[PDB]
């Protein structure tokens, strides 16, 4: 099932910074860090990365459990911001939920933190 995810997308965003991709990722978990702002640990099957933040327009997907731990989604619009210390933050502006947490049922593979 790691072949269901865009393996290498996390490294690509962190290195090349390009936003012209529509990666398919698994949500590992979600945490409010504040009108709540949600921080997501995402997986591309190879790596995990927690510097993801959801646009607040998408908050209802979290609050109604459609975007939830182990669900699989496809990002359709995101922005990259690069911090003074070299860290890159991804803001998820638009996405599609492709498969519910309940339909996936497990964390896919054994991704390691980027």
């Amino acid at each position: 099932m790691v072949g269901q995810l865009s393996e290498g997308a996390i490294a690509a965003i962190m290195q090349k910074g390009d936003t012209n991709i529509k990666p398919i990722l698994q949500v590992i978990n979600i945490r409010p860090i504040t009108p709540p702002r949600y921080r997501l640990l995402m997986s591309d099957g190879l790596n995990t990365l927690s510097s993801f933040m959801l646009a607040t327009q998408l908050n209802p997907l979290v609050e109604e459990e459609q975007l939830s731990s182990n669900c699989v989604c496809q990002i359709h619009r995101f922005i990259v911001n690069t911090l003074k210390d070299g860290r890159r933050v991804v803001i998820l502006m638009e996405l599609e939920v492709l498969k519910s947490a309940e339909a996936v049922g497990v964390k896919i593979g054994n991704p390691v933190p980027y």
Partner: peptide
């Protein structure tokens, strides 16, 4: 991958310059 603070500071690049 970043503190919550610098993640939130990243929403406002002027704040990120001096965080």
């Amino acid at each position: 991958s970043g503190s919550d603070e610098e993640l939130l500071a990243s929403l406002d690049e002027n704040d990120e310059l001096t965080a």
